[PDB]
Amino acid sequence: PLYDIYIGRDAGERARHRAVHRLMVGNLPTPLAPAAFQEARGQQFETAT
Amino acid sequence: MDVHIDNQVLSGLGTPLLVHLFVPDTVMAELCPNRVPNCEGAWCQTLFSDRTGLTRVCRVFAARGMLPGRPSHRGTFTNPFHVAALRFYDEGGLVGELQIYYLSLFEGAKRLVRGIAHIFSPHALYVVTYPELSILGAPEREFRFLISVALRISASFREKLAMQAWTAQQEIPVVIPTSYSRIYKNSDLIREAFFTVQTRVSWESCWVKATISNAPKTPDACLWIDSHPLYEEGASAWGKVIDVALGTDGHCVHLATTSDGQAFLVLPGGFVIKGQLALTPEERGYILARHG
Amino acid sequence: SPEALELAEREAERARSERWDRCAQVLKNRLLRVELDGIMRDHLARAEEIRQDLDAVVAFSDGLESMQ
Amino acid sequence: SPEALELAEREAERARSERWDRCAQVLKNRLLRVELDGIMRDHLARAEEIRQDLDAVVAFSDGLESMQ
Amino acid sequence: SQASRVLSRFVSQLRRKLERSTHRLIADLERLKFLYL
Amino acid sequence: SQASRVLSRFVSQLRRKLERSTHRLIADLERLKFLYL
Amino acid sequence: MTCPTFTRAVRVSVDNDVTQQLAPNPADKRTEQTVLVNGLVAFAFSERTR
Amino acid sequence: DRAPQIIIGNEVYADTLAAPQFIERVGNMDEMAAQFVALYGYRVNGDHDH
Amino acid sequence: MARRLPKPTLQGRLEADFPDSPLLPKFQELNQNNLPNDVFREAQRSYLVFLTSQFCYEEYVQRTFGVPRRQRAIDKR
């Protein structure tokens, strides 16, 4: 969940995957957390602080 | 700074004078991309701005550490015109040569640690001074050396094509799609292949390692290959050993050197061209002093 | 074909030449910047010596009527 | 698939053919050289100015001693 | 009475022209690096 | 006899060192002209 | 009088946080962004106005 | 505290001691009424593509 | 310039035809010696822009300075 993985095309050597940190909450894909979840979470944050 | 007192007991063995140093991690990122290896193996060398050279002092085996300054990240701890060379490596095969020019080590020891400009790579290098105790030719030699050697190999390939009545055959049984009807412009294959062969230069190319063989028995049965992408789609890899797949995958120009002086140019589609390797005793000796 | 060969050869020549001219330009640029910084550090080191000796003039002037 | 293979290869061909042109210039080194001569002329002028003032300093030191 | 005048006014005259050359080098080298670097 | 000792010795010390900076500029600017160009 | 030159693009690249540093490649631990200098963001243009 | 880099065009930029190398200072219109001629001279003659 | 936006549509023969302005005597100094008619006219046009900018700024500066108290004290006599 914390890392977004991909493959690069190979050249001169078999390619090795690469991973980037998602760095934030909102970068989770919409299939795993739809937008309505984000609206509910924001409303909960506001009621929190 | 412990390796510095670790050296000086036996440091006088190899070389009369040395300079203590520290190398940032972003500076090492030139040598060892996609990795952060330790430098316990890392063995130095020395270099002079004339034909004379001495190497293999093996100065410092140094661990990583943060600098004494708090805002110093996490870097790797360790005639005013020459290209001093250093060679880092680990227990594995991850080896990298870095250049240093004087006017950075002499002037860099100014005043007990200070940043200096690195001419070869645009980043700072830190030098620590113990408080109690013909400009362009010097970097231009290796380049023209390797360029002329590769051009000699290219001329051999051209004459071997001339011997075959300007035709080619296969020596690696890979079935082509048989759809080659100037698709990929079968002439452009050899045009771009010669492009990449004559352009690219690296001290660790295939023929470099193939010239210097430990034994007579084993390297006869050993092949040294390097394949690089067509039209610079990526980075090159040098010095793979063969104790075929490379003829299959397209857009990879393959160069295979034997220990005997044979070179082989493999194109996408398994076609093989032969060439000969010839080095005078002087260039052989210079390469033996460098690589060995 | 025989004719593509010399084409590739001259293209390799031009590519190597342009690479070299550009690398020389960049290196000379960084080197001249480093030289300017060295010149400025030397010149401040010598203007500081001038200041120090002029202030020595001042100090031994302050004791002149004392050595009369 | 051969079609997409040749298409991607020709795309890289286009990219690394456009990457090919570079230029060179000479006059800038001459201009930067003449800049140094200008700076040298100016600094020598100011040096002789301040030197002549320092020389007249001595005459104005020995001269006011007749005013006492 | 004269020494307090001389060995102080001449000193100021020398130092306030000492500083000018440092200021000029500061200006001119930065002019060099901005104009052609 | 003491002013004659001061106001000439110090002036020599100042002139010979105002000569130093110009000597060094002469040296180093030509070093730039030859060594990096 | 002091109106600046052409607007430009400049790429800033920083390392990530110490809590997110862990990864085997040094290239990945950085994140980068592009700043427009002396330019301005803008809304959709009309056809006559473009 | 994380080591940042400013990639301006082609050139990298690391230290604030390189601040007089890569970054320009334009003061107030009041104070910058002295060098407007050189500003215009660079605006017209200058080579902005590099 | 490898590329630039096309020139904005403008009138022609501004500097000479309509006005005779205090800028013209300073403007006359620049010369065309090497440049062709087109590039010379374009650089001329840019220099006229620059002179206008200088003049506008210089007049605005004294517009900003304010009102003197003494001239208002003389309002009586």
Swiss-Prot record, chain B:
Its main location: virion. InterPro entries: UL17-like. It holds the Pfam family Herpes_UL17. It is found in: Virion; Host nucleus. GO terms for biological process: chromosome organization. It comes from the Viruses. Keywords: Capsid protein, Host nucleus, Late protein, Viral genome packaging, Viral release from host cell, Virion. The keyword Transferase does not apply. GO terms for cellular component: host cell nucleus; viral capsid. Capsid vertex-specific component that plays a role during viral DNA encapsidation, assuring correct genome cleavage and presumably stabilizing capsids that contain full-length viral genomes. Interacts (via C-terminus) with capsid vertex component 2/CVC2. Belongs to the herpesviridae CVC1 protein family. This is Capsid vertex component 1.
From Swiss-Prot, chains E, F:
It is found in: Virion tegument; Host cytoplasm; Host nucleus. Large tegument protein that plays multiple roles in the viral cycle. During viral entry, remains associated with the capsid while most of the tegument is detached and participates in the capsid transport toward the host nucleus. Plays a role in the routing of the capsid at the nuclear pore complex and subsequent uncoating. Within the host nucleus, acts as a deneddylase and promotes the degradation of nuclear CRLs (cullin-RING ubiquitin ligases) and thereby stabilizes nuclear CRL substrates, while cytoplasmic CRLs remain unaffected. Interacts with host CUL1 and CUL4A; these interactions inhibit the E3 ligase activity of cullins. Interacts with inner tegument protein. Interacts with capsid vertex specific component CVC2. Interacts with the major capsid protein/MCP. Interacts with host TRIM25 and YWHAZ. Belongs to the herpesviridae large tegument protein family. This is Large tegument protein deneddylase. It comes from Epstein-Barr virus (strain B95-8) (HHV-4).
Curated annotation (Swiss-Prot), chain H:
Disulfide bonds: none annotated. Self-assembles to form an icosahedral capsid with a T=16 symmetry, about 200 nm in diameter, and consisting of 150 hexons and 12 pentons (total of 162 capsomers). Hexons form the edges and faces of the capsid and are each composed of six MCP molecules. In contrast, one penton is found at each of the 12 vertices. Eleven of the pentons are MCP pentamers, while the last vertex is occupied by the portal complex. It comes from Epstein-Barr virus (strain B95-8). The chain holds residues 741 to 790 of 1381 of the full protein. This is Major capsid protein. It is found in: Virion; Host nucleus. Homomultimer. Makes the hexons and eleven out of twelve pentons. Interacts with triplex proteins 1/TRX1 and 2/TRX2; adjacent capsomers are linked together in groups of three by triplexes, heterotrimeric complexes composed of one molecule of TRX1 and two molecules of TRX2. Interacts with scaffold protein; this interaction allows efficient MCP transport to the host nucleus. Interacts with capsid vertex component 2/CVC2. Interacts with the small capsomere-interacting protein/SCP. Belongs to the herpesviridae major capsid protein family.
UniProtKB/Swiss-Prot annotation, chain I:
It comes from the Viruses. It is found in: Virion; Host nucleus. Interacts with the major capsid protein/MCP. Participates in the assembly of the infectious particles by decorating the outer surface of the capsid shell and thus forming a layer between the capsid and the tegument. Complexes composed of the major capsid protein and small capsomere-interacting protein/SCP assemble together in the host cytoplasm and are translocated to the nucleus, where they accumulate and participate in capsid assembly. Belongs to the herpesviridae small capsomere-interacting protein family. This is Small capsomere-interacting protein. It comes from Epstein-Barr virus (strain B95-8). The gene is SCP. The chain holds residues 1 to 77 of 176 of the full protein.
